[PDB]
């Protein structure tokens, strides 16, 4: 918890309120939190042999903001990972609660990855591509999975990628993982 | 006379305890005697009768299903489950005393409880910002109930007690109760009957007996009753809520009092307690006693 | 409604029917049909469903009903013209399903009519 | 020690948006009830609004507008006495939006162009429909019986101000236009005769 | 304190387009719905797009300050109007200007002839690289269309009331020659002001010569 | 900031059709029909294709940089003209092209000889292969009709406008040299300019040059 810890974050822009005994604490940028807390996970297993989970809750928010209301907020973030059996991560909105593995995995390296070498390898792809993909998804609708595959029919994306997108987006569960990946990649892009 | 009180809030309540941004879903006795001291001192009513003839019971919840009781504070031979099990229905919590009540049936009465919601307002303040300053914000606690739920509270007290806490609930129901009322929150509705329920579980017998309201006894009642006891001791503070008390609003005394809920083997007496420093009128705190007689 | 040998038809058929027709040779649907033809269907049902759209009533007007039966005669009309299109007609049961709509005369019903359509023209627009 | 309970429901003329995230969706919600998701009109806006016009038309120091919304200055300790409820979405505007299908929020796409740049940044609000209606409940406290008439006429002149000014949001640009209709004026608590006494 | 209404008419001189958010498109429909009264159905002129507008045009024709990083720069007689937010200097906006709502004189007007209240502008984009058309659909507010529109002045300084008017004459004189909505360099948006009246509502002051 | 107010008239050499979608019609009848204002059903000519074509035959005289794939990389008088969306080089549009309308004196002139503003052109393609006619039928605005058009200039630099106006200028003779809306390769849509009146609505600047 304290001597561990500080070798696992070193390199990343984070500040640990506290660390006391089970339960941490910690402030930092929005995307080196994200990637420490999957670091914090897998050193965790190794240390404990995999006999032990934590649970936790990811928030975002501004510089601005104040810092209690970033404790509160966020902690009923944890109470919704740790309302689930066992091992769950509650990543930004409540909506978005994802397995340790399925956050590092499945959302980060199956589906942002591809994304990410999508928009920079085609100039014709463009933040407001991803916006109208991003619309299509987060539509319970069936008929916006058909005109998703007449966007990306249009879009002259890459065969494997376009053929990946859309069956990710049949999927009720993969939908939710291509949305936050999305997502991960808009807030990445930024500015 | 025992009668039983029931309050639907229209719109959500503050019902604060330390801060304004934190809210609590009940109020103690304390709290519920200041308001109805407040409203017989706006209702030019005297205040004598209700401070000595009056004994009331802290606000708990209730559903359309079930009145909810304090958890008592008693012996348990899983502990999580208690700890979050802080209202029992009163059909269980006789059960709970005779200590059937197993930890999984604990969680379950826990999770029964359908009070409500509690939420946080953000608002803010604009004056300074005519003034050639920034506006500044802040939060206010809130609790709203389900339509079927809401808060109740028993009283016991004579014939005339009983139609003057008539009067001042019925002037209550637009005062409002709790925080930041008269700004937006603490409107409710009351309704006051006889409950054959609560009377039976009044008049009882048992070894053991159970605070109903927040209360603390005198030094000489105290030498006999804190011996074999187990209960919360909660600290009251607060600042006065008056215009004649002084020319700027003062803290009150700390008062420190036995949590409702909290179980004594030998009873105690309440009194009503003054907790004013050099005010031009003395600030009462309600600490009588509201007795449950159980068994375990 | 549902088609022959008891399918059922949705949005799912619609990908189902676009593909099993999908023939490799380029990209041919339904025995030549082009994206042309798919897109003057499309105009047709594009008016209707703006018709319909506007209004808000649930129950199809009397108006809209005899677009109905105005796009049931371009539809003969269509695939007299042109094989593909009323093989295309044929498989898809667009103009049973007009049928169908007209039977049910409700706005529900012929908005679902109108997604099956679109979701026709979307597939066929991916398999190419 | 009277209590007079005002009665009334607040119409809304233009999208009213009292505020109160992901990216792509409204980061501009607006007060909802907690429980039943419904948009309410807090009863600290209304006050609080009333308060600043009622400061606008006299001129805060003015003890007429003091006493009438709470006092906490030193040796000027006054209890507020209009206490204003959170407006409640209608029952009556709810089934209205019920038939019809149509949300009770609607949601507002704004650009701002930058003076410099001349590049436009996208902020998507949330504003009560137009249509709408939510009840509204005041208590007017009758601390004195002599004030009273002079306490409503200053609610009137808040109300009629109100009506040509927003509630919350930003009204300088179309949002908040409010109407009041008052059901009824009655004295709930005490002997008081309020059947001349009109809000409006 | 007192108010000042204008009440009056917008007359559409070309097919106006003011941007809709949040509804999905179907294949084929319309690529830009214009923003509707969800109630009623019928396009409105945002009071935030006539505000904006009008704004811009008389900062302009007053002049910008050099390299003018925000809307709190502009000139002291625009942030007297429009209102500041310049931290510790703070300005109330004077000018609330509402939505402008199709009329019921135009609804009638088009109920009669049984025309559309909004027309589907078809269009293309021809490209520079390979001469395709992309074709697209603007939905437009017909050229038919008045829309009443209601704007309150709060007479803060009387001594400025005058010059606060005259501004706003020649920023709606810059409206009419410029134009309201989106693609108005492309001939859509323009407009005809046509003030009703300027009455008081609120206080004893005397607005006719305005 | 001065606006200079162009208004003159477009007269119709050779038949005008301009595409407008979203009409269905009867079999073996009218299959593609003009551009409308729909409150008044007369024939329009959009300011979208005035302002197009002008930019596109502007932009092809001044020349095309090798491998232009967007209008944002026009020439900067171009874009100065027409405007500009370029990141980091957003240019504000100075010409502001209105829809042409029909103009009341030709539809008079129209009435007084009992003819249609609009004619149904009879066409038809011969196939290579088979030599087999397929017939179209394309709605034209009928020769000599005069739409009356409203252009607005915004005089942001003082400096450039002489050499805007010659390149507005310089754009209307090739407009005038070309076609305006569609099939004018096949002899359609030829017109003519006849410019009214060159003013300053705003401002104090001096437009009698010009």
């Known amino acids: 918890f304290k001597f561990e810890l500080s070798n696992i974050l070193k390199g990343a822009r984070i500040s640990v309120i506290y660390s006391g005994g089970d339960d941490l604490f910690l ?22 042999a995999g006999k032990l989970t934590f649970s936790a809750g990811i928030g975002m928010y501004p510089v601005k903001y104040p810092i209690s209301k970033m404790a509160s907020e966020t902690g009923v973030l944890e109470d919704l990972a740790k309302r689930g059996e066992k091992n769950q991560v509650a990543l930004w909105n409540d909506s978005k609660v994802f397995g340790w593995s399925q956050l590092e995995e499945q959302i980060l390296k199956e589906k942002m990855i591809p ?20 619309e299509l998804l987060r539509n319970e609708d069936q008929i916006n999975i058909a005109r998703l595959a007449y966007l990306l029919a249009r879009s002259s994306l890459s065969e494997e990628l376009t053929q990946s997108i859309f069956a990710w987006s049949q999927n009720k569960q993969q939908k939710v993982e291509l949305i936050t990946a999305i997502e991960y990649l808009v807030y990445q892009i930024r500015e | 006379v ?92 006789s059960e709970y005393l ?93 309704t006051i009957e006889d409950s054959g329920k609560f009377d039976s579980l009044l008049s009882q017998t048992g070894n053991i007996a159970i605070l109903l309201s927040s209360a603390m006894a005198s030094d000489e009642e105290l030498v006999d009753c804190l011996e074999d006891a187990r209960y919360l001791l909660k600290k009251r503070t607060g600042f006065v809520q008056s215009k004649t008390y002084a020319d700027q609003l003062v803290k009150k005394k700390d008062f420190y009092a036995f949590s409702a809920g909290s179980t004594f083997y030998q009873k105690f007496n309440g009194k009503i307690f003054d907790v004013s420093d050099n005010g031009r009128h003395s600030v009462y705190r309600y600490a009588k006693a509201f007795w449950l007689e159980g068994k375990i | 409604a549902k088609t022959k040998t008891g399918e059922m038809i949705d949005l799912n058929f619609a990908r189902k029917v676009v593909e099993e027709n999908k023939r490799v040779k380029e990209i041919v649907l339904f025995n030549g049909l082009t994206t042309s033809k798919l897109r003057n269907l499309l105009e047709l049902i594009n008016h209707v469903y703006t018709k319909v759209y506007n209004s808000d009533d649930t129950t199809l007007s009397e108006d809209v009903r005899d677009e109905l039966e105005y796009l049931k005669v371009k539809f003969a009309y269509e695939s007299g013209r042109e094989p593909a299109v009323r093989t295309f007609i044929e498989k898809t049961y667009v103009d049973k399903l007009v049928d169908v709509v007209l039977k049910k005369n409700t706005k529900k019903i012929f908005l679902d009519y109108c997604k099956y359509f679109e979701a026709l023209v979307a597939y066929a627009k991916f398999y190419r | 020690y009277s209590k007079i309970r005002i009665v009334g429901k607040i119409d809304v003329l233009t999208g009213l948006h009292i505020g109160g995230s992901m990216i792509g969706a409204i980061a501009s919600p607006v007060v909802r009830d907690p429980y039943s998701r419904l948009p309410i009109i807090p009863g600290s806006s209304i006050k609080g609004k009333m308060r600043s016009l009622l400061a606008k038309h006299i001129g805060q120091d003015a003890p007429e507008i003091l006493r009438l919304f709470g006092s906490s200055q030193k040796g000027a300790i006054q209890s507020s006495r209009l206490q204003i409820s959170d407006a409640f979405f209608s029952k009556a505007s709810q089934e209205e939006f019920d038939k019809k299908d149509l949300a009770y929020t609607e949601t507002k796409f704004e650009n701002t162009i930058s003076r410099l740049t001349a590049v436009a940044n996208p902020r998507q609000i949330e504003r009560v429909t137009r249509g709408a209606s939510f009840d509204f409940h005041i208590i007017y406290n009758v601390e004195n019986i002599n004030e009273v008439m002079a306490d409503f006429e200053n609610i009137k002149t808040a109300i009629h101000l109100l009506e040509n000014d927003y509630l919350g949001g930003g009204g300088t640009r179309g949002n908040g236009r409010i109407r009041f209709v008052i059901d009824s004026i009655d004295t709930v608590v005490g002997d008081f005769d309020s059947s001349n006494l009109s809000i409006k």
């Open chain 1, 115 to 134: 994304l990410q070498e999508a928009l920079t390898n085609s100039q014709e792809h463009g933040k407001s591509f991803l916006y109208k993909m991003l």
């Open chain 2, 2 to 93: 025992v009668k039983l009180v029931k309050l639907t809030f229209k719109s959500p309540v503050h019902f604060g305890m330390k801060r304004l941004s934190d809210s609590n879903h009940t109020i103690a006795a304390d709290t519920l005697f200041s308001a109805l001291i407040i409203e017989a001192l706006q209702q030019q009513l005297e205040l004598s009768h209700l401070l000595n003839n009056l004994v009331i019971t802290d606000l708990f919840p209730y559903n359309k299903t079930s009145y909810f009781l304090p958890k008592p504070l008693i012996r348990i031979e899983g502990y999580k489950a208690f700890k979050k099990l802080t209202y029992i229905p009163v059909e269980n919590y």
């Open chain 2, 98 to 190: 005779r200590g059937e009540i197993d930890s999984l049936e604990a969680s379950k009465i826990a999770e029964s409880l359908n009070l409500g919601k509690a939420s946080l307002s953000t608002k803010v303040s604009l004056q300074a910002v005519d003034h050639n300053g920034e506006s500044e914000p802040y939060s206010v606690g809130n609790f709203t109930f389900y339509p079927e739920s809401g808060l109740y509270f028993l009283a016991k007290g004579n014939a005339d007690t009983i139609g003057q806490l008539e009067i001042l609930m019925h002037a209550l129901q637009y005062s409002g109760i709790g925080g930041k009322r008269s700004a937006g929150y603490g409107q409710f509705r009351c």
């Open chain 1, 27 to 48: 402030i930092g940028a929005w995307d080196d939190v994200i990637s420490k807390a999957l670091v914090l996970r897998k050193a965790f297993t190794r240390f404990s």
